[PDB]
Subunit: 117 residues, 4 copies
């Protein structure tokens, strides 16, 4: 009956590839392959921690083309990240305490040209 | 596991009223807009300001249907001015299996809060 | 199965009566009578919107003595509110959509010397 | 209705490590402290900085038990420095009826992160 909020998964230190300098559009668009590795769903709430500038903000994920390696921060969120910035993108899920106690988040690590693992 | 998913949003509406001496804290929204985005009276919402980048949270109430109003008359007026473009969103939870096919309710706007 | 986050209740425009100038203690302590009127529980998460200075922060409620009319912002939260500031204190609850569609929040309105109603 | 309630907290621990060139985003916490406050590995937490008033959110991981460590080595280092006093909290949900008698797990500290 008591329900925990747990890290579901994250993209650890991916690089922002696009940020609408016009603040058009919405959401953070993410290569479907990266969503798959982190267990993140289209339209799922996400938290973004910008390691480069310290900004922390929340939005939702949408899928970019598989293999594009895109991390695109659009809309209002382009006020909080720029091309080249290193970010951690996380989703959180809820579950009962017993499940939470053995829960393992899905983590994808990145380097270079948004190369996963 | 239970996911948090985008229920719906108003994509790029303008703030229409923002006098910080109205006393409230809610964002009052044309009921036609609430209907399109599936947002409820008294539902938590997030507001993302496209003009100034400020991001904040409050709850929704109805403004007259047809009025096209987006009002942060009240406390939320520290975060938006009239003419500012914003995105207003709400989020819901549901089991993972349902979340995988979930479709948010999105309303798009042009000009003077005209729904497309 | 789809679950909404709804305003449970709020204290509308109460005045802060104490704010640890030392940043000691924790939480926001609230006259039990006010908690009762707003449907807010001891240890419940609350959002505070400071109408005087525009600051928005989240913490948890604890009960102050019934009839004390206390609104005390302690700990880190005294960095965000001062004695005399006008605040709105809200709690949010989750429930299914059908229940959300006819839900009525508990609202307590204040004036003067934290006089309710 | 489902309430959000304070599950537990570490009341006035000091940040012990905060080098922003460690690359992470989590807050690493002595397992003895996690045990006392009921906070889990990978659980969302809120951190409230008593020294500078900054408030932020991340998740918990274990540091060695006995180490007395509170580490924001990583991204959260923009929000706290070593020697800063913080409160670390987690929140859980449960039905209203259970929430009415819920008791959070609170650990109090003195001096050099010594649990009382």
């Amino acid at each position: 009956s008591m329900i925990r909020t747990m890290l579901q998964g994250k993209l650890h230190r991916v690089k922002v590839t696009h940020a609408d300098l016009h603040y058009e559009g919405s959401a953070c668009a993410i290569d479907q392959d990266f969503l798959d590795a982190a267990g993140i769903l289209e339209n799922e709430a996400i938290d973004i921690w910008n390691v480069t500038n310290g900004k922390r903000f929340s939005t939702y994920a949408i899928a970019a083309e598989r293999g594009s390696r895109i991390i695109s921060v659009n809309g209002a969120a382009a006020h909080c990240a720029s091309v080249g910035d290193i970010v951690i993108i996380a989703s959180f899920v809820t579950m009962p305490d017993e499940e939470a106690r053995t829960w393992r988040p899905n983590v994808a690590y990145f380097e270079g040209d948004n190369e996963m693992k």
